[PDB]
Design a protein around this ligand. Structure first.
Ligand SMILES: CCCCCCCCCCCCCCCCCC(=O)OC[C@H](COP(=O)([O-])OCC(O)COP(=O)([O-])OC[C@@H](COC(=O)CCCCCCCCCCCCCCCCC)OC(=O)CCCCCCCCCCCCCCCCC)OC(=O)CCCCCCCCCCCCCCCCC
Ligand SMILES: CCCCCCCCCCCCCCCCCC(=O)OC[C@H](COP(=O)([O-])OCC(O)COP(=O)([O-])OC[C@@H](COC(=O)CCCCCCCCCCCCCCCCC)OC(=O)CCCCCCCCCCCCCCCCC)OC(=O)CCCCCCCCCCCCCCCCC
Ligand SMILES: CCCCCCCCCCCCCCCCC[C@@H](O)O[C@H](CO[C@H](O)CCCCCCCCCCCCCCC)COP(=O)(O)OCC[N+](C)(C)C
Ligand SMILES: CCCCCCCCCCCCCCCCC[C@@H](O)O[C@H](CO[C@H](O)CCCCCCCCCCCCCCC)COP(=O)(O)OCC[N+](C)(C)C
Ligand SMILES: CCCCCCCCCCCC(=O)SCCNC(=O)CCNC(=O)[C@H](O)C(C)(C)COP(=O)(O)O
Ligand SMILES: N[C@@H](Cc1ccc(O)cc1)C(=O)O
Lengths: 178, 88, 69, 104, 56, 458
């Protein structure tokens, strides 16, 4: 969610992702801890049995067969962490998330409460206004002529710079806003 | 009320606690900056198992693209703190 | 610790609701009081036979005082 | 000129809350705005809504529902007293009707 | 000082005056349809010792 | 009933003599007063109509329509003054003049005693609507919309005119009372069939009937907000009122001339409800909703029973209020984001809670939640159709399932989910908009409290 994706996944990445998926589904099948540990050690042995195959074609064939076996033997109802995309609390608190710009529309009577908070907010807004043009200039310099090729962004490099395009990442609402 | 307000020290303590219960890592030789591959001499499968153990410890999932990059306990602690809005 | 909770401005909706309640009540409390006072102290008419030779007014063919008025 | 015509640029939209934080959304003039709000609320809710509902609720019975109920009560009482059928299938007296002479 | 007030708010009598004029014209229209006043078989009635017409 | 007509004609110079910054206040105040005066027409009899003069009369069918018209004028004024702020004083006065002239024409149309006077006023309503659409609409399509609005109407109404004058040469009168008392049956000949079609098609295209409805999405989408309000709430009901008036001379031909129109109405009600499920423009969805409800009204008028007539009257009133409210609700979002695409602005319940409550109530009345008068009209029509044929409950039933779906779909798309991140110009709701929503919705429930006022002469 945080890292910029690459153009493709490598063979090692696919093997590791299959290993994690297989272990998770095996834990879903093996509810008890000791049984899961036993069969997970067996699965790890089965995985590292073919770790030293120098023929890449045979390696991809083995990966293909393993993925077919996984799809046949997957748990139809695997365990999902409650806040994971399939969980029971996945987007539960999205209705409580309010963007910060709404605070600009508060009536002055509402802003009369919380004076110090709004003074700090004004300081942050001043910082963003002072940093924007330098961020844009740094992005203009660091970008190759044929446009960017990845979604990775550079850090700040100068004396008192800020990493470009930082406002909406830094001022995230919260994970439990209200 | 609900769960206490998790702090950075608690996160680091639990991460180190999980790591010292791993039989492939020497407890004394382990520090918060030790690299899994260079310092500790583990391979990628061990790193996947470590990430899964962290997920079980803290009750949430770390996506594969983010989990591949974590290489020392400090990165794990920082990722967990950033995810859970921990600042103290 | 106590944290600031970001919400949209609730001032204007509350103001509108208060204004609507005020005006509705401003005209509807006197109406309710008047209806109650009329009902208590000027009841409904009682049905009766038309006396011989009498031609009632049209509003005399209804029983509630407000309807008659 | 690489242009097609001389035109004004499309202007940004004005926020009524900027010059009047409590603006009611009726007019840019605060006093005219406030009085527009007041007249709308007084003549829409106070006068038409509540008083009109009260006027309609107490409208006199020109539909003659109660009159019809009382007439039906008298008719039922009389017919049940004398043993006549409550209602007749004919609403017009046949002695006032002249059927055609021949049906063949 | 009522000069400015009148010249600013004299447009507020047009609609009430129109309402009154419409009522008057409706009464005038009713005045032209009295050909069967107190003459229908259902409502024909003997006049009271004082009243002149049954309705206006 | 000049006590209602003359005050509107007085609204005209009152608007044209007002100070530049008092036009809206004066127009709104005196429009509300005229509505209060027109409230007295609801005192109706059980036997005949209120015959004011040789020219005007009031029935139990036209009085709620007049009340709705006079009540809709101030709401239109309130909804229009936001997007007309930059306009010049003369053009604002001209816009208000168009609205006033439309109200006057509608008021005289609903109370005319003769059919040719009714025809003249019912065509005269065309000019202000067309001017409003083509002069104050926002996009370039408005011009095309205007053309679609005009000719679709006139191609229906020009035959009717001919039929009308023909009838006056045969019976000697077009007075509605004389026409009703001296009614004679229509024989089964080709001439009578074409007379029936000439008498029916204009009202059919006004409803509109499915297949003749293409003008409506264009005209109701391209119009300004007041134009859409008056098009959906009142101008569609001209067809139903005219059909219920004209059917008194078409028996017993209707007994079999209604079949193609009944089939079109039922199947096209299903079709337009289905169309509402895949719509990217929020205004077009509301327009197709209007088409489905009017198909129900057409079925009710065509089967010609007392229960169907009561249901048709109730449904017309309820739909007018509900569709006007829905158009205003969509216009608030459009004025905020300047786009009619439904999925552009989402999660608006988080930003505007009271407006979300208004949305919920409007969508609840659209799906005819009991005991709303929407549901009363729909249920009366469904019961009458069941008496007409037991199989209709299938199609009607399907409609009831689809309506709710798309209705809730609309709500779920606009109010729920997460807000769009890049839209940062969503200001809090103004008092004017909340008051507009309340003045739409409160009369609906108040009418539920006393439903016999909108059930018609039957
Ligand atoms: C909040 C705003 C926010 C926005 C919201 C939107 C608002 C929109 C509003 C729009 C405008 C609306 C206007 C509509 C106009 C309609 C008015 C109307 O027609 O009135 C009708 C009706 C009056 O009818 P009526 O024709 O005038 O009466 C005919 C008779 O002549 C009369 O009979 P009577 O001779 O016996 O006299 C009775 C008299 C006196 O009766 C009594 O005194 C007896 C009562 C019992 C007392 C007995 C014991 C108590 C005393 C004992 C102790 C003291 C004595 C001993 C002392 C020592 C102590 C030991 O009382 C009355 O006169 C009736 C009350 C008057 C109410 C009028 C309503 C006007 C409202 C208009 C304003 C609208 C806005 C609302 C604002 C209003 C202010 C809040 O008023 C009622 O509502 C009555 C309802 C109460 C009946 C009981 C309820 C039965 C429940 C059954 C259902 C069960 C299901 C559960 C649901 C329950 C939920 C309720
Ligand atoms: C049934 C209980 C009876 C209680 C007795 C007294 C009831 C007085 C109600 C007067 C009329 C309501 C005013 C309408 C405008 C809404 C107000 C507003 O804008 O909110 C600001 C106001 C300020 O709060 P806030 O903190 O700023 O939060 C606002 C946020 O936006 C978020 O606010 P929120 O989340 O709290 O939601 C606002 C609320 C308000 O939204 C609404 O939905 C209210 C409008 C009603 C739905 C309209 C379509 C349904 C068609 C049915 C028509 C029924 C009308 C009957 C005649 C009414 C006379 C005017 O919506 C809801 O809470 C859920 C709605 C689901 C209702 C399901 C019930 C269906 C019908 C069931 C029975 C109905 C017939 C009763 C007799 C049956 C045989 C015994 O909100 C409130 O105070 C809460 C509203 C109260 C809910 C009323 C729901 C039950 C009443 C139904 C009809 C009344 C029948 C009375 C006869 C006696 C029985
Ligand atoms: C914001 C907070 C909301 C919740 C809080 C609310 C607090 C409580 C208030 C809610 C009250 C609950 C309503 C319960 C009903 C009680 C009133 C009821 O009994 O009165 C009805 C009366 O209601 C009225 O008749 C209906 C109102 C008329 C509607 C006209 C609306 C005004 C015109 C506005 C413009 C028109 C646009 C629509 C065009 C068609 C009954 O009529 P009826 O059974 O006979 O009475 C018999 C005795 N009489 C005849 C002597 C009087
Ligand atoms: C897109 C939607 C537009 C709006 C929809 C409008 C619907 C209009 C449809 C008209 C309904 C019926 C019209 C006439 C009634 C019967 C028609 C005919 O088919 O029935 C038979 C008629 O018999 C034959 O069919 C002769 C008619 C055949 C010629 C008509 C051309 C129809 C072909 C389809 C053309 C499409 C027309 C619509 C264009 C848009 C009945 O036999 P018969 O008892 O003897 O005739 C009754 C009349 N009598 C008693 C005087 C003799
Ligand atoms: C729920 C039940 C369904 C599950 C069934 C699953 C069945 C599959 C079991 C067998 C699958 C295999 O072994 S597939 C065998 C695949 N073998 C190879 O690719 C050889 C080349 N080696 C490498 O790529 C790396 O060493 C790598 C291995 C990635 C380690 O990564 P690191 O060292 O850099 O961390
Ligand atoms: N057409 C109906 C209208 C009506 C409906 C319900 C009523 O309670 C009264 C009247 C008559 O009878």
């Amino acid at each position: 969610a945080f890292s910029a994706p690459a153009a493709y996944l490598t063979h090692q990445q696919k093997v590791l992702r299959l290993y994690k998926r297989a272990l998770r589904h095996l834990e879903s099948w093996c509810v008890h801890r000791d049984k899961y540990r036993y069969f997970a050690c067996l699965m790890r042995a089965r995985f590292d049995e073919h770790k030293n195959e120098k023929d890449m074609v045979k390696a991809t064939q083995l990966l293909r067969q393993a993925e077919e076996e996984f799809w046949y033997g997957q748990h139809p109802q695997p365990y999902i962490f409650p806040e994971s995309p399939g969980g029971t609390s996945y987007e539960r608190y999205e209705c409580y998330k309010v963007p910060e710009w709404c605070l600009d529309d508060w009536h002055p009577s509402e802003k009369a409460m919380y004076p110090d908070y709004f003074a700090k907010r004004e300081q942050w807004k001043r910082l963003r206004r002072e940093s924007w043009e330098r961020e844009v200039k740094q992005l203009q310099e660091e970008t190759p002529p044929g446009g960017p090729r990845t979604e990775a962004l550079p850090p700040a490099r100068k004396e008192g710079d800020l990493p470009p395009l930082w406002w909406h990442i830094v001022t995230r609402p919260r994970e439990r806003p209200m | 009320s609900d769960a206490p307000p998790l702090t950075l020290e608690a996160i680091k303590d639990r991460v180190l606690y999980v790591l010292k219960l791993y039989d492939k890592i020497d407890p004394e030789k382990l520090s918060v900056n030790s690299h899994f591959m260079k310092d500790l001499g583990l391979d990628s499968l061990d790193q996947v198992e470590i990430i899964m153990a962290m997920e079980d410890e803290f009750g949430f999932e770390i996506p594969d693209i983010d989990a591949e990059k974590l290489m020392c306990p400090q990165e794990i602690v920082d990722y967990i703190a950033d995810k859970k809005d921990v600042y103290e | 610790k106590r944290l600031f909770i970001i919400k949209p401005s609730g001032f204007y909706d509350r103001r509108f609701l208060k204004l609507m309640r005020f005006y509705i009540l401003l005209t509807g409390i006197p109406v309710a009081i008047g209806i109650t006072l009329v009902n208590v102290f000027i009841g409904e008419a009682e049905l009766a036979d038309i006396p011989e030779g009498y031609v009632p007014e049209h509003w005399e063919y209804f029983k509630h005082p407000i309807s008659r008025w | 000129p690489t242009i097609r015509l001389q035109e004004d640029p499309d202007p940004e939209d004005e926020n009524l809350y900027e010059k009047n934080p409590d603006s009611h959304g009726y007019d840019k003039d605060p006093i005219v705005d406030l009085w527009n709000m007041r007249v709308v609320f007084f003549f829409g809710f106070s006068i038409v809504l509540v008083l009109g509902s009260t006027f309609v609720a107490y409208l006199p019975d020109y539909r003659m529902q109660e009159w019809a109920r009382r007439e039906a009560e008298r008719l039922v009482k009389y017919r049940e007293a004398n043993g006549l059928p409550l209602m007749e299938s004919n609403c017009f007296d046949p002695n006032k009707i002249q059927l055609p002479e021949d049906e063949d | 000082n009522v000069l400015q007030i009148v010249r600013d708010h004299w447009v507020h009598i047009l609609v009430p005056v129109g309402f009154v004029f419409g009522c008057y014209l409706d009464r005038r229209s009713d005045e032209k349809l009295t050909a069967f006043r107190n003459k229908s078989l259902l409502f024909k009635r003997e006049l009271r010792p004082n009243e002149e017409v049954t309705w206006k | 009933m000049l006590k209602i007509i003359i005050p509107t004609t007085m609204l005209l110079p009152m608007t044209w003599m007002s100070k530049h910054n008092m036009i809206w206040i004066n127009a709104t105040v005196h429009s509300l007063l005229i509505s209060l005066i027109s409230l007295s027409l609801l005192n109706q009899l059980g036997e005949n109509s209120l015959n004011f003069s040789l020219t005007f009369f009031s029935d139990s069918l036209s009085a709620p329509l007049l009340v709705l018209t006079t009540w809709l004028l101030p709401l239109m004024l309130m909804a229009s003054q936001s997007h007309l702020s930059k306009e010049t004083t003369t053009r604002k006065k001209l816009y208000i003049t168009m609205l006033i002239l439309l109200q006057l024409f509608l008021i005289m149309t609903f109370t005319a005693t003769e059919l040719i006077l009714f025809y003249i006023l019912f065509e005269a309503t065309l000019v202000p609507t067309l001017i409003i659409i083509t002069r104050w609409g926002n996009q370039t399509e408005r011009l095309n919309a205007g053309l679609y609005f005009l000719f679709y109407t006139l191609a229906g109404s020009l035959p009717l005119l001919v039929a009308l004058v023909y009838i006056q040469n045969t019976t000697g009168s077009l007075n509605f009372l004389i026409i009703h008392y001296w009614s004679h049956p229509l024989s089964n000949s080709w001439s009578n069939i074409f007379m029936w079609l000439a008498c029916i098609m204009a009202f059919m295209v006004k409803m509109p009937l499915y297949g003749l409805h293409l003008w409506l999405p264009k005209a109701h989408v391209e119009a300004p907000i007041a134009g859409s309000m008056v098009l959906a709430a009142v101008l569609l009901k001209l067809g139903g009122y005219g059909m219920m008036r004209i059917t008194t001379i078409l028996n017993p031909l209707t007994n079999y001339m209604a079949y193609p129109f009944l089939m079109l109405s039922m199947w096209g009600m299903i079709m337009t409800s289905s169309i509402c499920l895949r719509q990217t423009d929020l205004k077009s969805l509301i327009a197709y909703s209007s088409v489905s409800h009017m198909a129900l009204v057409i079925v009710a008028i065509m089967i010609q029973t007392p229960w169907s007539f009561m249901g048709a009257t109730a449904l017309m009133i309820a739909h007018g209020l509900t569709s006007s409210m829905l158009f205003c609700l969509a216009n608030t979002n459009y004025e905020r984001v300047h786009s009619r695409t439904m999925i552009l602005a989402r999660g608006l319940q988080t930003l505007l809670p009271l407006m979300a409550t208004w949305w919920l109530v409007a969508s609840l009345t659209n799906l005819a939640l009991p005991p709303s008068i929407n549901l009363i009209g729909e249920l009366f029509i469904i019961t009458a159709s069941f008496s007409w044929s037991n199989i209709t409950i299938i199609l009607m039933g399907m409609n009831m399932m689809i309506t709710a779906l798309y209705s809730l779909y609309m709500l779920i798309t606009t109010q729920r989910g997460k807000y769009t991140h890049h839209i940062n110009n969503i200001k809090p709701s103004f008092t004017r908009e909340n008051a507009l929503m309340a003045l739409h919705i409160l009369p609906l429930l108040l009418l539920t409290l006393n439903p016999k006022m909108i059930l018609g002469p039957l």
